[PDB]
Design an enzyme around this catalytic site. Sequence first.
Site, PDB file in Angstrom:
ATOM      1  CG  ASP A 150      -4.708  -0.310  18.211  1.00 39.45           C
ATOM      2  OD1 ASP A 150      -4.481  -0.873  19.309  1.00 39.45           O
ATOM      3  OD2 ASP A 150      -5.781  -0.502  17.624  1.00 39.45           O
TER       4      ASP A 150
ATOM      5  CB  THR B 152      -5.866   1.822  23.509  1.00 36.51           C
ATOM      6  OG1 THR B 152      -6.228   3.196  23.377  1.00 36.51           O
ATOM      7  CG2 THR B 152      -4.725   1.532  22.581  1.00 36.51           C
TER       8      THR B 152
ATOM      9  CG  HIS C 174      -5.475   3.539   0.940  1.00 35.33           C
ATOM     10  ND1 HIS C 174      -4.936   2.323   0.599  1.00 35.33           N
ATOM     11  CD2 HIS C 174      -6.739   3.536   0.474  1.00 35.33           C
ATOM     12  CE1 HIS C 174      -5.832   1.606  -0.042  1.00 35.33           C
ATOM     13  NE2 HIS C 174      -6.937   2.317  -0.134  1.00 35.33           N
TER      14      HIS C 174
ATOM     15  CB  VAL D 163      -9.851  -0.492  15.797  1.00 31.69           C
ATOM     16  CG1 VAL D 163     -10.666   0.774  15.682  1.00 31.69           C
ATOM     17  CG2 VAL D 163      -8.562  -0.378  14.994  1.00 31.69           C
TER      18      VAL D 163
ATOM     19  CB  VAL E 230      -5.521 -11.841  -7.527  1.00 27.32           C
ATOM     20  CG1 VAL E 230      -5.735 -10.752  -6.443  1.00 27.32           C
ATOM     21  CG2 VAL E 230      -4.115 -11.749  -8.134  1.00 27.32           C
TER      22      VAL E 230
ATOM     23  CB  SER F  44      -9.258  -0.029  -0.281  1.00 25.61           C
ATOM     24  OG  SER F  44      -9.254   0.437  -1.633  1.00 25.61           O
TER      25      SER F  44
ATOM     26  CG  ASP G 223      -2.234   0.595   1.031  1.00 19.39           C
ATOM     27  OD1 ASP G 223      -2.308   1.805   0.735  1.00 19.39           O
ATOM     28  OD2 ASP G 223      -3.239  -0.147   1.171  1.00 19.39           O
TER      29      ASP G 223
HETATM   30 CA    CA Z   1      -6.510  -2.390  19.939  1.00 15.55          CA
END
Ligand code: CA
Length: 274
Positions: free
Chosen positions: A41, A78, A63, A80, A173, A220, A32
């Site tokens: 995180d 903490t 992105h 996500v 893919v 994406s 990316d």
């Molecule tokens: Ca986390």
Amino acid sequence: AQTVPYGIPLIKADKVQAQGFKGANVKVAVLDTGIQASHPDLNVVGGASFVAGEAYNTDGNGHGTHVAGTVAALDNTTGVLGVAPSVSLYAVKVLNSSGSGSYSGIVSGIEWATTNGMDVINMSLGGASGSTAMKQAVDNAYARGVVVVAAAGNSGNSGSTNTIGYPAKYDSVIAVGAVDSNSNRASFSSVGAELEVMAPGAGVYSTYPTNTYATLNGTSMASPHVAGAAALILSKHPNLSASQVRNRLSSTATYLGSSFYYGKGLINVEAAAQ
Ligand SMILES: [Ca+2]
């Protein structure tokens, strides 16, 4: 407080994780715009940059840090939670700050991934045209046992004109389409006979530059859910061949409707992994 994006329970990622399988030992490379390695995180173990003037560990676009977050945001108190939070994250920069990449840069990223023993490759990018080099790069990786995952495209479905991008269009893919929290196909999601599976791609919240978290839309955001699912499946069954992991994903996908718009349906990691 750690937030749990709808995306993880929707694909039944939480069930598998609860069984103890979190992707440990599986090497996942995110091709990316790089990743903000300093993000609290995330745990980026390494990678490479094939973009001029930008090292792999920075992300001036956002992105890559977002896609990376969906795959491996750390399981803690903490931010996500990623699909496979105990995976080995490698940031491979092949896109610039504008989110654009040349074929050679991408091709280098794929080759690097194969040569450096990655297990899964995520490519949340796609153009209208392909390339013989890119096709070779992707055929060999998959033939070398690497699970290749790419975004289907965000061209929607005007017409009846197959809008799947490349490299998603290639046979080696896995082409990932996008659905919302209600499991309905998101209007922007590309359609076509090469469409394989669906994954959450509308309104997904994940890690974002400069130690924050933001919500984005796009196939994406869908691709990393599948890349992480492959990583889970591999952590529970390390003796599987790429195509075997591939087959589990398609065979157990929850039927949503015509494949032209949905593929085999929405992925279900618990069914796919057992
Ligand atoms: Ca986390």
